[PDB]
Design a protein around this ligand. Structure first.
Ligand SMILES: C#C[C@]1(O)CC[C@H]2[C@@H]3CCC4=CC(=O)CC[C@@H]4[C@H]3CC[C@@]21CC
Ligand SMILES: C#C[C@]1(O)CC[C@H]2[C@@H]3CCC4=CC(=O)CC[C@@H]4[C@H]3CC[C@@]21CC
Ligand SMILES: [Ca+2]
Ligand SMILES: [Ca+2]
Ligand SMILES: [Zn+2]
Ligand SMILES: [Zn+2]
Lengths: 173, 173
């Protein structure tokens, strides 16, 4: 399948942004495969509000890191094996009741419990970058992620309202 | 080496409690090996205050779970492979700067960042149970853990003020 570059040159902005109708979402999970040699960066960001209702999955020292900030929880957590070995890795992020689960290469490596209540009309998903300055993170990192993404599925496509790209998407071909 | 049972009959109380002089602790880590077929229970608990400054490492659905509550963070997180396969597993919990790291069988499986500041004169460590009712946890579980512990090392022995046992310790021999 066709893979895309996760950063556009400088890596100061997402390669793509998707907007969703929260009330229409039935599928509360996302999946994709990523390949990279970069130990730090944003794989994807999501929010309903950039100020007080956001989430980020990235890499720090080659391993998955999740930062999350909402009414119920505020945290910075690293988990799972290193993924900056240049191999393709299957990744799934799911909402299971009030928790968020992260599975890597078929194995559950992290479950953040009691982090989300009810389900805020819209949710945004940005790939390879944030929708606010890096300095705004609970724990800053340099967002640029030099890697490839493919076979990605984001939430509920039927609930997708729109998709934007700062610049044209570059293939990892 | 000699291994001890992690629960005393009912499993309604810790098999042992150790108290430490916080100001004297230089070694901020603990290590041990555990073997069990039980998917749920408390491996160990720690606090400086049972009300607002506590930590718990246990098992839920066979996997490590950490609950933590203090000035800086409040969370319930599961991570790592299942450990209820009846095999001996090396476990290490360490303080690295402002974070808490959990390593299993030599691999880092979880890093809770930004969870602890400065370093509250005393710290208590209870094995196989809590120092408050289970219902008081952020997320309740049944504390009784049917398993064995051996080669355990808790914080800084030189900082240990005292050690108590509700009842006599039972060997897994
Ligand atoms: C709504 C909401 C939120 O609270 C704010 C951003 C949301 C996350 C956005 C990214 C995401 C993509 C998925 O495929 C599964 C759930 C997660 C979401 C879980 C609920 C969150 C974070 C806990
Ligand atoms: C002091 C303090 C605390 O905040 C309250 C209980 C403490 C924990 C008690 C158990 C423990 C044992 C170790 O070998 C490493 C650090 C951890 C401690 C980290 C700091 C904590 C939790 C974050
Ligand atoms: Ca990078
Ligand atoms: Ca049990
Ligand atoms: Zn909100
Ligand atoms: Zn305190």
């Amino acid at each position: 399948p066709p893979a895309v570059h996760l950063s556009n040159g400088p890596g100061q902005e997402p390669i793509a942004v998707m907007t969703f109708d929260l009330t229409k979402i039935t599928k509360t999970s996302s999946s994709f495969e990523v390949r990279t040699w970069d130990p730090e960066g944003v794989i994807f960001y999501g929010d309903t509000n950039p100020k007080d209702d956001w989430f980020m999955l990235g890499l720090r020292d080659g391993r998955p890191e999740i930062q999350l900030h909402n009414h119920w929880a505020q945290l910075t957590v690293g988990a799972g094996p290193r993924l900056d070995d240049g191999r393709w890795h299957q990744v799934e992020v799911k909402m299971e009741g009030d928790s968020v689960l992260l599975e890597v290469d078929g194995e559950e490596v992290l479950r953040l419990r009691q982090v989300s209540g009810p389900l805020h009309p819209i949710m945004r998903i940005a790939l390879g970058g944030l929708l606010f300055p890096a300095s705004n993170l609970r724990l800053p990192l340099v967002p640029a992620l030099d890697g490839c993404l493919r076979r990605d599925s984001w939430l509920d496509k039927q609930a997708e309202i729109s998709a934007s790209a700062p610049t044209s998407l570059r293939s990892c071909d």
